[PDB]
């Protein structure tokens, strides 16, 4: 249930587009710097599974230099990358 409807409940628009996982910015069709990055979900023995976590970033965010700060902020939230060391 996303995109505009008809008052008859049929999905009227073509192409519900992607949104940036950092900035919630709707990714346009010509935004050729916008990338998807698939991170492998891995198991208890350290070998990859058949499932991946995919996160997509808008093109202006990569253009400024702020994408690498955004990939960190996402993967801490998803639980992919640890935020600090454990205590010694």
């Amino acid at each position: 249930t996303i995109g505009m409807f008809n008052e008859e409940g049929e999905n009227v628009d073509l192409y519900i587009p992607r949104k940036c996982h950092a900035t919630n910015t709707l990714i346009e069709a010509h935004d050729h710097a916008a990338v998807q990055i698939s991170i492998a979900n891995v198991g208890p023995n350290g070998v990859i599974n058949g499932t991946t976590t995919t996160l997509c970033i808008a093109g202006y965010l990569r253009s400024q230099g702020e994408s690498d700060h955004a990939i960190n902020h996402i993967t801490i939230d998803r639980g992919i990358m640890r935020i600090k060391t454990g205590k010694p």
Binding site: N72, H73, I76, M81, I83, K84
Partner: protein, 84 residues
Amino acid sequence: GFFDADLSYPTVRTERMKHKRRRLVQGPNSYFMDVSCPRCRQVTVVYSHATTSVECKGCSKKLCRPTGGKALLVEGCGYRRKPD
């Protein structure tokens, strides 16, 4: 890194650097201290940025000297900062 700044709850490293009015809640920089006279020995309460020259009420001497910032206490006097 890996910890993002939270504007409501800023880091102690970030917040100790700030100007006193540029803090999230503004506050003093100064404090009071309990200054013992070099002779005479009686304690006085001297403000850290005392632009006036405070006198020892017992000793009759002046145990502080104003500066552009923190005032300078005389040589040979003992002082410990008071709380709050």
